[PDB]
Design a protein around this ligand. Structure first.
Ligand SMILES: Cc1cccc(C)c1-n1c(=O)c2cc(C(=O)C3=C(O)CCCC3=O)ccc2n(C)c1=O
Ligand SMILES: Cc1cccc(C)c1-n1c(=O)c2cc(C(=O)C3=C(O)CCCC3=O)ccc2n(C)c1=O
Ligand SMILES: [Co+2]
Ligand SMILES: [Co+2]
Lengths: 371, 371
């Protein structure tokens, strides 16, 4: 059931901001490995003396990579005179975040109708403020509140390309890479305790709720297009607890990137795993794919089923739809954040968000496949 | 003239160690953009709880990329019990280095006959010690002394693959990339004052000395295969001063990578500039290549000359030989460290090091070409 209890009008995921130590190298690695286009920048060449920010896009997916310059470049600046394009940025916060967690997501940004209203309502319902609403170039309003750990939920609202202060990248430097990724499906956080974390986030958004490892629940917006699952560990080793130990606390676990064609996406990504791209988790045993026809035989032809076997793609099914999924290795040095590629089948109305679930059935289907 | 005044037996450049925030993403970017093979690792999967280190190799060129884990992973370790494979590593030093300078070279490593003797003699002749000699697995000895800024000169000596504690990468994860790079030619540092810096480094090594921008001199070993130029700025804007401001002091400016075939190297690197690799500085004006036949007409055929024009390759000449060179854009966010590709022609005896010089003539040949 959908109570539709959003306390402000939420639309879609807008962007994901990574806080790194060197934004150039991460952006280039991600661009090549994921097939994302280099489309906007904010740095020294655009007059930003505070931070380097490079935007990658694939369809509607927007990845932002930000790193701090030497504070000496902007020592005489104050906040009213800053040359930073993202006003919530903070040298001390960024360096502390990066040295504490390593590479990871700082901001999950969602587009809203009015960021300042979204901030006010959120704080009045228990959200811890992080950056107050600020209007950029009389065009865009941005505000941030705490989500979990050091991750903040960012509200963006437009009066009427990314943000003021960003430059469109020249076509010569912008290679039209595309492996089929089109938008962000969901963003999942790991916390030490799911109870307080759900109560906190559901408390200020009004989002409703959608033997190995974790306990989890999924918070969703009204149209169920903004999906925010959260994991806690179970003790008795949990992948969630390993994340908390290596990340130094709560944070974002994985980003799910919907592909228009997961087969092409995975062929392009796997071709590049060993030449600068991303490695994937080991494939399921062949017993797993020898049981797929037993479950998804009416959805996937056995030509397509065996194509999932070469690519290592997982299949799960739901009340209303079918899910195709695969997980990469951790994106950086630490066994923390990783990426999942998905494509959903069913629930045609547009496609309703969350069609197929999130792969809970794949835990027992893989536990039993390895026998 | 060559005084051959080395105070200990120096052989060759051994490796360059980059200190980064995330060693996975930098290594992968460098691997793809430069065509270097992923050949050794030291991290969690090999029992290293202190730091992640990934070695790239192309011919004899060895690039090492190191980042610190969370100190919590090794809080109970002391130096005699450390699981770090590089014992000179220090969480506080690495994070301070990276947050102060951004991505850059921490260690220029040269192979010597006896690292502990090299350290003792160096310190007794005025070198500031950084890490005392330590014997690894009764096989390799490592020691470090300060070079300039936070860059240390590292001595490696072998009793008889990189270091103890590193694992050979499995062939499945090791793609044989190769764009023609074969060894490190020279490593150049920028300092605020060339006088004290030369006196300091020449003082403890015994190395002998080999209107726009800089003042520089080149220190060399006996066989002149280890070459260490140093730049200072001239005021009246200097690229050297810009480096010092953005790097927060002295450091390594550029690494010169000798290619067996600079034409193929540059074609492979340029093909990849916009898909995760490295950008190059803008090419000289066509007037420059319209004057190349006037100077190098006896060395390069005009088919090869015009091939330098498409690639943007610079040509300089010496008393004894000819130099081919090109410079990349800065490797990271800050306008600091960059890379130069070179191939030397002449001085056949093996080829004697430094054949062709370092491109001093290209300053006036480019100043006059732009007219
Ligand atoms: C990738 C990996 C590495 C080491 C250990 C493990 C358990 C895993 N791992 C997963 O992380 C994983 C995650 C999801 C997933 O996306 C998901 C959750 O199940 C929680 C609810 C929200 C959500 O979206 C589904 C299936 C998974 N499976 C099957 C899996 O094996
Ligand atoms: C690449 C770039 C960017 C912005 C500003 C400038 C001056 C440059 N720049 C160089 O840095 C450069 C460096 C060398 C060089 O390698 C070298 C030196 O001349 C000092 C002695 C040791 C040594 O090896 C040669 C030619 C150069 N030229 C011609 C050039 O234009
Ligand atoms: Co998921
Ligand atoms: Co040089």
């Amino acid at each position: 059931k959908n109570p539709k209890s959003d306390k402000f009008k939420v639309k879609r995921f807008h962007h994901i901001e990574f806080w790194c130590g060197d934004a150039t190298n991460v952006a280039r690695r991600f661009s090549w490995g994921l097939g994302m286009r280099f489309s906007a920048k904010s740095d020294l060449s655009t007059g930003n003396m505070v931070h380097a920010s490079y935007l990658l896009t694939s369809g509607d997916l927007r990845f932002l990579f930000t790193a701090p310059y030497s504070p000496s470049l902007s020592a005489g600046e104050i906040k009213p005179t800053t040359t930073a394009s993202i006003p919530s940025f903070d040298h001390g916060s960024c360096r502390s975040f990066f040295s504490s967690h390593g590479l990871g997501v700082r901001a999950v940004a969602i587009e809203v109708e009015d960021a300042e209203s979204a901030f006010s309502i959120s704080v009045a319902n228990g959200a811890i403020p992080s950056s107050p609403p600020i209007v950029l170039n009389e065009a865009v309003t941005i505000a941030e509140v705490k989500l979990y750990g050091d991750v903040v939920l960012r509200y963006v609202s437009y009066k009427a390309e990314f943000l003021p202060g960003f430059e469109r990248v020249e076509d010569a430097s912008s290679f039209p890479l595309d492996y089929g990724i089109r938008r962000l499906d969901h963003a999942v956080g790991n916390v030490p305790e799911l109870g307080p974390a759900l109560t906190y986030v559901a408390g200020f958004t009004g989002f409703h709720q959608f033997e190995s490892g974790l306990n989890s629940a999924v918070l969703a917006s009204n149209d169920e297009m903004v999906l925010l699952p959260i994991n806690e560990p179970v003790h008795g080793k949990s992948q969630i607890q390993t994340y908390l130990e290596h990340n130094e606390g709560a944070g974002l676990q994985h980003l799910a990137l919907m592909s228009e064609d997961i087969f092409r996406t995975l062929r392009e990504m796997r071709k590049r795993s060993s030449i600068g791209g991303f490695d994937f988790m080991p494939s399921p045993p062949p017993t797993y794919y020898q049981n797929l026809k037993k479950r998804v035989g009416d959805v996937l032809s056995d030509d397509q089923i065996k194509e999932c076997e070469e690519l290592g793609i997982l299949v799960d099914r739901d009340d209303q739809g079918t899910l195709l999924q695969i997980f990469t290795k951790p994106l950086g040095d630490r066994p923390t954040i990783f990426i999942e590629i998905i494509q959903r089948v069913g629930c045609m109305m547009y496609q309703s968000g969350g069609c197929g679930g999130f792969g809970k059935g794949n835990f027992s289907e893989l536990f039993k496949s390895i026998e």
